[PDB]
Amino acid sequence: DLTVKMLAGNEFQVSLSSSMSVSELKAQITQKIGVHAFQQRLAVHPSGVALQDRVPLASQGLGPGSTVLLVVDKCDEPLSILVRNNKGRSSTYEVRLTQTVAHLKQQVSGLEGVQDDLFWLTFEGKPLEDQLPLGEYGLKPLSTVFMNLRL
Amino acid sequence: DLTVKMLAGNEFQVSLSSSMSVSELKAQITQKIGVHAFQQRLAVHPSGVALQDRVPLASQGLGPGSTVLLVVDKCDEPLSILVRNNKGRSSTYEVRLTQTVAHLKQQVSGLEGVQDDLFWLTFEGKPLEDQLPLGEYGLKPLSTVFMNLRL
Amino acid sequence: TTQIEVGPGATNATINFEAGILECYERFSWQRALDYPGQDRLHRLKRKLESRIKTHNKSEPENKRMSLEERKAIGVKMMKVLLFMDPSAGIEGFE
């Protein structure tokens, strides 16, 4: 088991299997306490040195029974993106990375005048999932999300 | 002639008479805005590098037209010292570096039962002055202050 | 205006965090940059803060009780971690 320590002393445990990996640690934390992965800043205790997403946890100064530090970077600074409708017409939307893909779709529905279950969004080839926050897809100012029509 | 810039961004001028020492600069800042020397934290603009005491300002890149940054530290935290009455009996007093010498003499007066006008305090040979802060003399935990009687 | 669910440990955490907040207000006032309305917000937060610490302390064992000055130190470290986003500021704040 691994111990996660947050600001103000709160603690909880995480089980890492089969092998150690930063990417998985964050996914684990997300399931435990609901903190989005892209907001997680992990550091070794008591070193205070940030973990590195690439290198596994065993290959670092980290292992079993060791403590990690979690600080949550809100990453909720407003920004604007573009969503291109089926006809090729792109419109801007004010969003925050902490809002859900579902919330962006509600914004797109109203503007584009199309029911949300009648389409899905894609960014850089891959589809966006309703339950996930926009920040998981690394969207940037005036990025172009594409609208795709169901049947 | 030098520009002092405080935390808010407000500036005021200070003309260095001769030596152009940091001690002199602080003395002028005390005369100007009333901040005691021991409370002044000075640094170069805009590097932020702190001023060096035993070094001439003209040596740290501080000539006419230069700007120094002032941060005030009250130094209000409690410490204990000793006052030795004429007999040789040392007794402990709790004080703050911001309290005046007159204030301290009031404590000594109350404990020793001697009117303040009938004695004067000394530290390391030099007299303490009524209207000056205790921080003015670099009093440390359990520094000995001697009590001197008058005719 | 979006609330974040917390647990019991957040009460004593907020008291310390806001202690540090007070310590910053105070240091700022030394710079003579704190306007009059702002000075009132300083004095009231200290008033309430002392009222909450006194109320919280009695609710907890003596060996865990802390003074206004003791909590300030903890709050300062916590604030350094948030501003620099680095546990090194830091560690005393727990991360």
Add this chain to the structure above:
Amino acid sequence: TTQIEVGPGATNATINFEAGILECYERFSWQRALDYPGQDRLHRLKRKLESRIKTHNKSEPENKRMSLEERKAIGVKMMKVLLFMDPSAGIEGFEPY
């Protein structure tokens, strides 16, 4: 309770300082550490502060006009130097101990 004579420029200084205080409340809030009354003081401060900025921005030239988000950056800078009582790199470039 002793007071401190301020000066005209205190108004702007306090808006930025408290703008940094808000940034600290918010950041603390995401650590699941801010209790409910705390989160109330957070949102109250944000409202009050936001109205103060609009009121103060009308009287100043467009160049020195600052929005809540960019004022924050200034407030945290102040907070940094205060927390360390050290302008010395406390604001400009890194330097944490």
